[PDB]
Design a protein around this ligand. Structure first.
Ligand SMILES: CC(=O)Nc1nnc(S(N)(=O)=O)s1
Ligand SMILES: [Zn+2]
Length: 237
């Protein structure tokens, strides 16, 4: 279609919209359930029954409930992010998926509908060890095979976001099938630092299940899509 993601976020295409309300992020860490290997990436799952865990403000018409969050990475530290910024790609990218509780009855239905989801994207960059990320890194050995899952304790995704909350927003799609154009994209300008050793662990996962021949999980990002005549607006100037 015309509203596909990811895209290369370029300065020349950005238009400051001073009308964008403050982005309110409030997650209920207690609603965290398990972490599992989908066969494409690893994803942390939440219990979306809580009407207070989610996001509001910014470009959203109402509150969107947190459902899950995952990551995308490449075979080396030189690439892996889905989105690029003026052509530069980062080692990996974190996606926090929220769904429209107001317009849809549930996440399954939200994910393929008109304004079903709002996804925040955080670029990860090599730097200092990230304390909150370690909690995830430690249980990765338990989910190295496709479809494997491990229970999770309380975890607040906000600990994964950068301090500065300046972003770009635009209409897009899912970056995995069905590639439905149901997403309002919120990408953070400021990348979060993580150490190499933490990033390396992501690469020990496998696309293959138990018994099957070992197929390493790397390069699980979709290639860049054309912006078309979509409005890439920024919350900063
Ligand atoms: C079921 C559902 O909605 N899953 C997702 N597919 N692609 C996503 S991403 N990579 O756009 O955040 S989310
Ligand atoms: Zn994603």
């Amino acid at each position: 279609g015309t509203r596909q993601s990811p895209i290369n976020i370029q300065w020349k295409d950005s238009v400051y919209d001073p009308q964008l309300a403050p982005l309110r992020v409030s997650y209920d860490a207690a609603s965290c359930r398990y972490l599992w290997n989908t066969g494409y990436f690893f994803q942390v799952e939440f219990d979306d029954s809580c009407e207070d865990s989610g996001i509001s403000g910014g470009p959203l018409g109402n509150h969107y409930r947190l459902k899950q969050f995952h990551f995308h990475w490449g075979a080396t530290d030189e690439w892996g992010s889905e989105h690029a910024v003026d052509g530069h790609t980062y080692p990996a990218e974190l996606h926090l998926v929220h769904w429209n509780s107001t317009k849809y009855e549930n996440y399954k239905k939200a994910s393929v509908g008109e304004n079903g989801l709002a996804v925040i994207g955080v670029f990860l960059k090599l730097g200092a060890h990230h304390q909150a990320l370690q909690k995830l890194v430690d249980v990765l050995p338990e989910v190295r095979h496709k479809d494997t899952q491990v229970a999770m304790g309380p975890f607040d995704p906000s600990c994964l976001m950068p301090a500065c909350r300046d972003y770009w927003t635009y209409p897009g799609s899912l970056t995995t099938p069905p590639l439905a154009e149901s997403v309002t994209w919120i990408v953070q300008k400021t990348p979060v630092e993580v150490s190499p050793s933490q990033l390396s662990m992501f690469r020990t996962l496998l696309f293959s299940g138990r018994g099957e021949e070992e197929d390493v999980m790397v390069n699980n990002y979709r290639p860049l899509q054309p912006l078309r005549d979509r409005k890439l607006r920024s919350s900063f100037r």
